[PDB]
Design an enzyme around this catalytic site. Sequence first.
Site, mmCIF file in Angstrom:
data_model
loop_
_atom_site.group_PDB
_atom_site.id
_atom_site.type_symbol
_atom_site.label_atom_id
_atom_site.label_comp_id
_atom_site.label_asym_id
_atom_site.label_seq_id
_atom_site.Cartn_x
_atom_site.Cartn_y
_atom_site.Cartn_z
ATOM 1 N N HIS A 40 0.511 -1.496 0.168
ATOM 2 C CA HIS A 40 0.322 0.175 -0.018
ATOM 3 C C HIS A 40 0.535 1.736 -0.230
ATOM 4 O O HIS A 40 0.141 2.123 -0.188
ATOM 5 C CB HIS A 40 -1.316 -0.204 0.620
ATOM 6 C CG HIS A 40 -0.471 0.359 2.153
ATOM 7 N ND1 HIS A 40 -0.678 -0.719 3.554
ATOM 8 C CD2 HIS A 40 -0.103 1.896 2.727
ATOM 9 C CE1 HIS A 40 -0.069 0.413 4.779
ATOM 10 N NE2 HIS A 40 -0.219 1.307 4.250
ATOM 11 N N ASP A 84 0.048 -7.862 1.739
ATOM 12 C CA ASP A 84 0.145 -6.355 1.708
ATOM 13 C C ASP A 84 1.923 -5.873 1.280
ATOM 14 O O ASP A 84 2.317 -5.634 3.223
ATOM 15 C CB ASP A 84 -0.946 -5.103 2.728
ATOM 16 C CG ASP A 84 0.248 -3.748 3.125
ATOM 17 O OD1 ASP A 84 0.896 -3.718 1.581
ATOM 18 O OD2 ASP A 84 -0.566 -3.200 4.258
ATOM 19 N N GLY A 175 1.729 6.597 8.973
ATOM 20 C CA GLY A 175 3.081 7.421 8.508
ATOM 21 C C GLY A 175 3.938 6.392 9.111
ATOM 22 O O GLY A 175 4.905 6.351 8.563
ATOM 23 N N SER A 177 3.142 3.069 8.198
ATOM 24 C CA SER A 177 2.863 1.982 6.683
ATOM 25 C C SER A 177 3.489 1.733 6.747
ATOM 26 O O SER A 177 4.769 2.735 5.822
ATOM 27 C CB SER A 177 2.134 2.939 6.658
ATOM 28 O OG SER A 177 0.477 2.972 6.294
ATOM 29 N N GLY A 178 4.114 0.216 5.987
ATOM 30 C CA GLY A 178 5.289 -0.450 5.491
ATOM 31 C C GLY A 178 6.628 -0.410 6.481
ATOM 32 O O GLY A 178 7.841 -1.491 6.000
HETATM 33 N N1 LIG Z 1 -9.298 -3.766 5.726
HETATM 34 C C1 LIG Z 1 -8.292 -2.864 5.085
HETATM 35 N N2 LIG Z 1 -7.459 -3.933 5.103
HETATM 36 C C2 LIG Z 1 -8.228 -1.498 5.237
HETATM 37 C C3 LIG Z 1 -8.755 -0.727 6.012
HETATM 38 C C4 LIG Z 1 -8.456 0.862 6.093
HETATM 39 C C5 LIG Z 1 -7.269 1.198 5.203
HETATM 40 C C6 LIG Z 1 -7.156 2.669 6.006
HETATM 41 C C7 LIG Z 1 -5.671 3.199 6.627
HETATM 42 C C8 LIG Z 1 -6.073 4.726 6.680
HETATM 43 C C9 LIG Z 1 -4.313 4.698 4.794
HETATM 44 C C10 LIG Z 1 -3.167 4.782 4.916
HETATM 45 C C11 LIG Z 1 -3.193 2.758 5.409
HETATM 46 C C12 LIG Z 1 -3.513 2.598 6.574
HETATM 47 C C13 LIG Z 1 -2.462 3.370 7.781
HETATM 48 C C14 LIG Z 1 -2.511 2.530 9.010
HETATM 49 C C15 LIG Z 1 -1.390 1.842 9.712
HETATM 50 C C16 LIG Z 1 -1.470 1.413 10.475
HETATM 51 C C17 LIG Z 1 -2.665 1.878 11.347
HETATM 52 C C18 LIG Z 1 -2.923 1.014 12.881
HETATM 53 N N3 LIG Z 1 -1.908 0.233 13.654
HETATM 54 N N4 LIG Z 1 -3.893 1.631 14.272
HETATM 55 C C19 LIG Z 1 -4.163 2.242 11.315
HETATM 56 C C20 LIG Z 1 -4.019 2.811 9.598
HETATM 57 C C21 LIG Z 1 -5.484 2.410 7.315
HETATM 58 O O1 LIG Z 1 -5.126 1.428 7.308
HETATM 59 C C22 LIG Z 1 -7.069 0.322 4.868
HETATM 60 C C23 LIG Z 1 -7.220 -1.003 4.773
#
Ligand SMILES: N=C(N)c1ccc(C[C@@H]2CCCC[C@@H](Cc3ccc(C(=N)N)cc3)C2=O)cc1
Length: 223
Positions: A40, A84, A175, A177-178
């Site tokens: 992503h 992912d 932020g 992410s990855g």
């Molecule tokens: N069903 C899914 N697979 C799904 C659900 C929501 C999102 C968007 C969102 C927002 C866009 C950026 C990617 C990702 C960033 C992120 C990373 C860690 C955490 C956490 N540990 N709390 C939360 C958000 C996300 O979960 C992407 C995928």
Amino acid sequence: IVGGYTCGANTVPYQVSLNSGYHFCGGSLINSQWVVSAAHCYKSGIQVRLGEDNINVVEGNEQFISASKSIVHPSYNSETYNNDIMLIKLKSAASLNSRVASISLPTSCASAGTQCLISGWGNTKSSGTSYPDVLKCLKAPILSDSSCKSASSFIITSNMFCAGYLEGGKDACQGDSGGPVVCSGKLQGIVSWGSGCAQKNKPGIYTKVCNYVSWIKQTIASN
Ligand SMILES: N=C(N)c1ccc(C[C@@H]2CCCC[C@@H](Cc3ccc(C(=N)N)cc3)C2=O)cc1
Ligand SMILES: [Ca+2]
């Protein structure tokens, strides 16, 4: 990272920042020529920043190296985030040193309750927004699939695990992410997704790296 601590400069020497004019994702160095991140996080024009602590200040240990190739997992699904994971090859090999170092890949998966270290430059607030400039760290345990699923109502796959705290207050965030989840010396997870950050019954969701080691190894050997 919400509810974590300042790691200390270069204490997580496999952590990289992916930069496209600004930090947009984390990643993990797995050898001198390759980084692993989330699918992503895919985009064009990636510069990999190694040896970073403060991402806004040149501190003297950085290496900035452009990506020559990105390879998103063949079965990545952007709707569900299944698979992912993405590999990035560096245009030139990183110079490996105490502040720029690879992290070992798993030889088997990690089990529920194992403690891991999660790191990144993501949002540090559970409500609203604050982005740190230095690397943040969090120790967090892997949760059982069943407790995670019942608490959150998340739809996850066998290629994901949950980690963190069901009570909230400690979690990765946007932020991050990855970036890496390292457990007992091995890269077991990649920061993948979640709902909000550090919310009750909404733990972090991580790509289960042990399922991909064969693909990582074969892809690197052939590219
Ligand atoms: N069903 C899914 N697979 C799904 C659900 C929501 C999102 C968007 C969102 C927002 C866009 C950026 C990617 C990702 C960033 C992120 C990373 C860690 C955490 C956490 N540990 N709390 C939360 C958000 C996300 O979960 C992407 C995928
Ligand atoms: Ca810097």
